[PDB]
């Protein structure tokens, strides 16, 4: 659930999920269209696509459990939806951390009309 993804973000990047990742580029927070504007935005695009392969689950509200062996994210066994939601989130966080060095403030609150074109998952 969003509860988890967001604390996972915070633990990983050091930034708060809502301001920093809730409205970035074209795909972070409201995804529907356009070309992702960067790494971080692409992370969100792969993330939205990951949720996409789970039409019968509920990403934002279904809670899963996870632990850290050392720095590593390890998803604990739950329902099949929960394990798979957890795997999509783990990816996004790592993806966010691997591209922190190019995170740009100019893509915060990015206007909708500047997101043009479909891109296939």
């Amino acid at each position: 659930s969003l509860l988890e993804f967001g604390k996972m973000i915070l633990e990983e990047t050091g930034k708060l999920a809502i301001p920093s990742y809730s409205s970035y580029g074209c795909y972070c927070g409201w995804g529907g269209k356009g070309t992702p504007k960067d790494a971080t935005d692409r992370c969100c695009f792969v993330h939205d696509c990951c949720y996409g392969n789970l039409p019968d689950c509920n990403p934002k509200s279904d809670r899963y459990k996870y632990k850290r062996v050392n720095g590593a994210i390890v998803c604990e066994k739950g329902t099949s939806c929960e394990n798979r939601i957890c795997e999509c989130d783990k990816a996004a966080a790592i993806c966010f951390r691997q591209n922190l060095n190019t995170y740009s403030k100019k893509y915060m609150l990015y206007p909708d009309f500047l997101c043009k074109g479909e891109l296939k998952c």
Partner: peptide, 4 residues
């Protein structure tokens, strides 16, 4: 704590 995030998005959508």
């Amino acid at each position: 704590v995030i998005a959508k």
